[PDB]
Every structure is written in C-alpha cells, then in structure tokens.
Amino acid sequence: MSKLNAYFGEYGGQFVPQILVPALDQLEQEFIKAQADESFKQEFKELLQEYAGRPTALTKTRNIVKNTRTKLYLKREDLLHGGAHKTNQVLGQALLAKRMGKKEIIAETGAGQHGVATALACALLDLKCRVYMGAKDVERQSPNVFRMKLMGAEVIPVHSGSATLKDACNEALRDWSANYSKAHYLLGTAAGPHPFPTIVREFQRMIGEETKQQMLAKEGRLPDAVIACVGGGSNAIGMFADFIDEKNVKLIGVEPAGKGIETGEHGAPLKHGKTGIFFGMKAPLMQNSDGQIEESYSISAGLDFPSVGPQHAHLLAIGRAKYASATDDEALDAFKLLCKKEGIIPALESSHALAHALKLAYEDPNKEQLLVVNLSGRGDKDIFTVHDILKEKGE
Template sequence: MKYEGKFGKYGGIFVPELLIPAIEELEEAFYKFKDDEEFMNELHFYLKEFASRPTGLYYAENLSNELGCKIYLKREDLLHTGAHKINNAIGQGLLAKYMGKTELIAETGAGQHGIATAVIGAKLGLKVKIFMGSKDVERQKLNVFRMELSGAEVIPVDMGSKTLKDSINEAFRYWISNLDTSHYLIGTTMGPHPYPSMVKFFQSVIGKEAREQILEKENKLPDTVIACVGGGSNSIGIFSGFVDDEDVDLIGVEAAGDGIDTNEHGATLTKGTEGILHGSLSIVLQDEDGQINDTSSVSAGLDYPGVGPEHAYLQSSGRAKYVPITDKEALNAFRLLCETEGIIPALESSHAVAYAVKYAKQEENKGKTIIVNLSGRGDKDMFTVAKELGVSI
C-alpha cells in the first residue's frame, strides 16, 4: 500500500486477506485518477450537468429571526436524487468505469445512497446491486421503487438488526466473490483505506462551495458549521472547507434514538469506544466483549453503530464537537423548518437543524452566523414522519 490511510491512530485497513488485492487496485486507481485531467473534467461535468451543482447557500430568514442567529442552509437537498450522496456516487462510479469494472455494489440505509448509485449505474451503463436491511426496505419503500426503476437489483438483508450495519456486511461478502468485475461503492467515510479519504475527496465539493458562498454573502467565515453524522460523509464534506480555520466551530450531530440513556441508541461518538468495524479502527458501539450493539433511530441513514475514522480523530483532537439529538427533537425540527421556511428536510438533516435550534437559543450564541448542512430532502420520510406524529396519510 502506498498510503497508510490514518487519521491520527484511527483508520487503516482491517480486512480479510482476499480483499487486499482489490484494496490495492482501488488505492492505485484513486490516487492516479484524482490528478488526471480527463477524469476530473468528466467528474466536474457530471456534478454540474447531471447533479446540478453548485447548490445554494440559503439564508433562512424566518428561522433566523425566530432564533436570533443568522442561519444559512447548504442546500444539498436540491441535488438530483435528493441528497449529497450523488457527489460520491458520481466520483466512484466514474472511477469504477475507468478501472474497467462492469458492476457497482452498494449498501444503503435511508436509500439515498442506493438511489444515487442506481442512477449513476444507469447513466454509465454499469449493473447495480443494492444491499439494504429489510427493516429499512419497509420504511423506505419509495426509495426502493426508485432504485428498481433505475435498473438496480435491491437485495433485502434479514440478518442481525436488519439495518445499515448488516447490509454493509452482506455487500462486503458479495464483493469478495466478485472482485474482478465489481466495485463496492461505499457511501460514507467508513471502511478500509482508501475509502474514508476517497469519499471525503468526492464530498469536499460541499465545503469548498460553502466557504466561497459564505465569504461572498457575509464577507467573513461563519462562527459555526453544523451537520448530521451517521457514517459521516456529508459532515466531513462540509467540515473539510473549514477544518483549517480554528475560529470556526465544527459540530457533528448524532442520532440518539429514544434518548441518550436508553439501551438502544446511535450517538456513537458520544457513547462508543475504540474498536474495529467494517475495515477500520474508529469509535463503535459495542459491549464489553466487543460485540457490536444494535442501534435504533427514526432516521434510517443515521442508524449505524460506527462512524468514519476521521470523525473519531476530529473528536479526539478537539477540532470538532459531537452531540446527540433524540428522535423527538429531530421530528420537532423537521416540523419547524417546514413551518418557518417551507423546506422539508430529510430526517437525517433534521438532527442537524434540531441542534442548530438548541445552539441558537443559548444566550452566548445570540447573533452568531451558522451554516447547517441540509444534506437531503424529506420526501422519502413522509410515511415515517406521519406515523411518528400520529397522522394518517
């Protein structure tokens, strides 16, 4: 391997020996093509013409007036397929094509990464297999249908907790059996090197745009950047534009499910310990024997017992702060953004909005300028939200 893929002590490569040749092939291709003019020109073309970048940095005037802060929303929800996931799917899909692969494999929780992979597979002429926990298949039926319409095969996973963790396990198993023809298009900043660095590279467009946009609008950097964290791709993408600016606070918001003190929760960086999960050393939710805990969240995309290794490093170094938000708080924020701005956020993004509300209400934060990464739109969550709110639709 040319690079260690470490963030402090976190990251690295912890995979079966059978996967090492594929990991080495992927590392070589990524570091070659990210500096290749033809590849980058094609990537930028698809980001602009297919995904509709750049996305806006929207001043949420009504919400700002209500909370006493200047709140800007980075509108990743306006992208094709409805979330930031398309940025990385385009990048890795193109990379797979340049590597001569004929099939994309992906895992998905909320379905946004699955849709993004399905549409880029359709665009580039690649077969697509999507592994999805059967629990998530049920609560994200609309997204499953959208994947299938784009030609993808959606494979329900009935093992374990039947959520994102288990779909990742099955995707790895399939990849090991099909290394010559397939590329595993991981959707977040977890996994063995080079995935955390590669996904960050393809998602860094969010941070680059947001930095330029806030300077244009405010003539200064924001005081705080807030984003939700499951595996952590949207957050690492926007954080990357400000991580070198020590005066900008970075806050990652995790899903705490029914509450931080319950047995089932997300909030990996709040409650987890060091461990190895899905190919890298990071912070994970595990018992005293090292067995991975099940998680529970109203948000399928944050329902994951690990986190990308760079987030573990950012927390340990003190550069970023990570906080929990409960299902109830996220649902309240979902409704608040709908009512104040007419914007329907994904439940994942609603966690970030919820903490922005709590943050803005603190007296010492009055008047601050905040960017919230609105990582996705809430169309996919309508039935879940209605059920939680006791509304019949």
C-alpha cells in the first residue's frame, strides 16, 4: 500500500498548488512507514509518558454541578507539558520529521501556543525551528516570543500584508514549497491538506483512548457524551476518534459564538458556513456571497479560525456528532466558575466546551448524566484577557 484516503465524504482533499504535491506525497509515505515501525511507536509513547506527562488525569468535579444529578468529568490536558494538548501532535510530527532525515522545521503561530509547543519539541529532539509570526502578533505576545527564543527557535516576524496569522501561513507554506527537501512544516491543527487531518488525529488519539479506559476503571460504564471545543479540530478529534465506533456515546463539539451568531462576529462555520475550498482543503467556510473568506472572531485566539477540520464536517453530515456554540460571555462565566467551584483555571478555548456542559447539567438538573469535558489547556495565558474584560465591564 502506498496511498491513504484523502477525503471524509467529499470533505478535505489536497487543494494545494502543484509545487506542494510532492511534499504531501512524501510526508504521506513516511507517515505510513512510521505507523508500521514499532521503534517509532515506542519512542512516541516514552516521549508522551516520560516527558510530556501522559497519561493525564481524569478529574471528577466536586462542586460546579453539585446542585444537579450530573456527574461531570474533566480530561486534564492542562496538566500536560506545555499546558495544552498541542504538545501531543507536535512531538509526533517532530519525531516523524526526524526520521525523514530532516533537521529543520517550519511553523507558524498567532497567539503563540503552537509556536511554543513547536519550539520545545525541536529543542528536545535537536531540530532547527523557524516559526513565522505576524508583526502585530509579535508586538502583542512579548512573553510567548521570549519563551520561543529561550528554547532556541528563530522567530521570523512577517510584516507584509495584514501582518498577522493569515500572512504567516503564507510565508510558512511558500517556505515549505521551496525547502521541503530539508525542512518539514508542522501544521498546527487537524485541518489543511491531506495527510495533515489524518496525521493530527492519530497523534491526538490517546486523548480519547485514555478517557475510555480511565472511565471504564473509574465509573464502570462508557460516558453518555464527550464534549470538546472545536477551533481547527485538533483537540476535539483527539477525544472523538476512539469513541466513534461506540454507537451510544454522543460526540458534542463546541464552536465559539463570539459576540453572538446574530452579530456576525463568531467563529462557528460548521453550523453557519457554506462549504468551500480554502487552506488546501474542501470544508465549511465563513465566506461572503462572492467567495471571499470572512474574518472570524472569538474571545480565545485558539478558536479564531474561519474554517474547520474535514473529519468534523463529515461527522456532522453523517449524524455521528452534534456541534454547538458558546458565546464569549458563556465561556467567560464558565471560566470564572471553574476557578471558584473547582480549583482549575481553564483555557478560554476549553471554557467553551465547559460552558456547554454546564448547560446540559443545569437545563435538566434531575437527570442522571455522565459527561466528559476535554480540558484542552491551562488558563494562565488568559489571565490578562479575562481581567481586562472583567474590568471593562465591572470588576
């Protein structure tokens, strides 16, 4: 075998310029060999366990839904090294690029989370790491740029065009077009061209794989539902993947509603977007009547992405997974609740999933329910954001 399906029910594909096709074909073949090499699989596990901290805890909340009959569990990806789930698939891709014989790694980031995760992986595995970043984002993210530089990565500000994340993807991709023989491009989420959506899923699988086995040993049954936020799709497909064949487990993804779907400032194309072709894939898009992609918005930078992974769009059109929305205020109030009732500061990305779970609990408080929230990351990065929105209102 020398080919893997690039589609999820006519979602996905490889809609890249021709110059990039040999890069994708090469990356696909190496990934297939990697999944067959057992020394690769063991090095990946020793990396996730002895270095990244896996398996991560599965915490049972004590007070946030005490007034109900809902037993609410949290998959503690905030306790992973790096403070977010990204570390999982970043260690995998970097290890994958190491056995392609490559020493260089190209990456892009907006908030800085993916950039920091790429830097720490390349530091441990001795890889030359170049991260592209919008000149405006460089100015707004002084602590994360200093983190990336402390770990030996080259931060390349991009001043052309909008000088933000959309322009760093252009530089990183065109860089990969010229230099894919020596460098690999560490894509940040489960979207884009094949085989990136499939590779990221296989390197985030252990999220759902651990929950299933942890939940069997803790509560005894499979959960009634698993809930995870959906920006590009990375952490949600990580949770869903091993639950897809369990027919009686609902899969709920939560997209950001921003200031309200009725206001247009949102990031929920899965249920409010026309299917189109963008970022090298065919997928739901926030676009106008002419085909121009529209600006997305969320209070958390991790969910500010006007498209979504292909396997998610597929899972919606088959009826296997339901996708919901949470506004800024719903995630903010869920943020403040988890700090006060539990002892955890969640990532504002993760708070969208939590806010939805708090809905399912408070709307039917007498219903026996067993729910899982994929706590995709720590909230220390959002301390400054939450404080300014609270002070701008009344705190």
